Amino acid sequence: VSLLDAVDRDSRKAETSAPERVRQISFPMMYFKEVESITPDEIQGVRQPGTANELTTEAVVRAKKLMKIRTKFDITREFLFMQALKGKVVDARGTLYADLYKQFDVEKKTVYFDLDNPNADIDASIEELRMHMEDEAKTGTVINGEEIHVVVDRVFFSKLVKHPKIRDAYLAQQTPLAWQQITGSLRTGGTDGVQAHMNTFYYGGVKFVQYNGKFKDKRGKVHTLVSIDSVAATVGVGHAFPNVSMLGEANNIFEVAYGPCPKMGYANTLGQELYVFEYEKDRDEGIDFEAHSYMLPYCTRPQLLVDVRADAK
């Protein structure tokens, strides 16, 4: 919509508004599979490591293998969720399946903090982030930009904590929060699964959380969850995405799709989170296992995902 322009009363001229636009898109999905088997050759004459005269049993091997499969699937799901939150979906092998910014033809915004410059204004960057998240929503309703998640890297966290503009500002305050954040322990967050508490920092109404998750591929490469693509490890990086309460449940932004199994009986059934199948070998030679998954996480408003960088350029 635009602004009307004044016209002469006796001339009887007028202006008119333009029509709207509509378009359509589509998405593929990712498929995963796993294979395992059990053979009697792994049971006979095998001493239990924890004892001197006890032999292993089928139940132990079965339980270990099942736990390993489930752990692998959970790790893969976590990695995929992080990738979706980063704005692009790619498997561990680099194959590209979804490009949210291409399909929704919207540019991604990055915010520079210039933490290496003593005169850098963190407040300006924070206000820029708030203004972006509030103005770019395009939802036709009031938006509260204060409610956002911020996942930060170790280097970025250290650089932010060291900055004089924060150090002196908090030193000058004789309040319990200032005392704890300067001389106390900042570890007061929840649990990420490896450590009891996560680093947390409060400043200007924003909450910063440090995440150190990482994994490894089938060929040794280490994948970092928080690291931005193609950025040096020595430069602080992070990602910011909106909260659930920011838009409410009626306008949920994060979704996950599940498809059906390619086996008989699942021609058009609703997909589940995981399939497990068991098949005994012919001539009682052993047992076989299988696990299937078919999913793709996606975002319905990619312009609300923002990157953060410690340096400025």
Binding site: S26, D135, K138, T139, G140, T300, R301
Partner: protein, 53 residues
Amino acid sequence: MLTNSEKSRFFLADLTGEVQSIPNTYGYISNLGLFRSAPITQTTFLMDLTDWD
């Protein structure tokens, strides 16, 4: 809801709702309610100004 596939008339695919975007509309000053409505009958109006020292 099921619809035709991307490029085949004899296959189906699922249609997952819609997404909409609406332009922003600032209204701070109008809500402030400073101005009063003073409807008139003619196309112009007059006023008188006075003073002393």
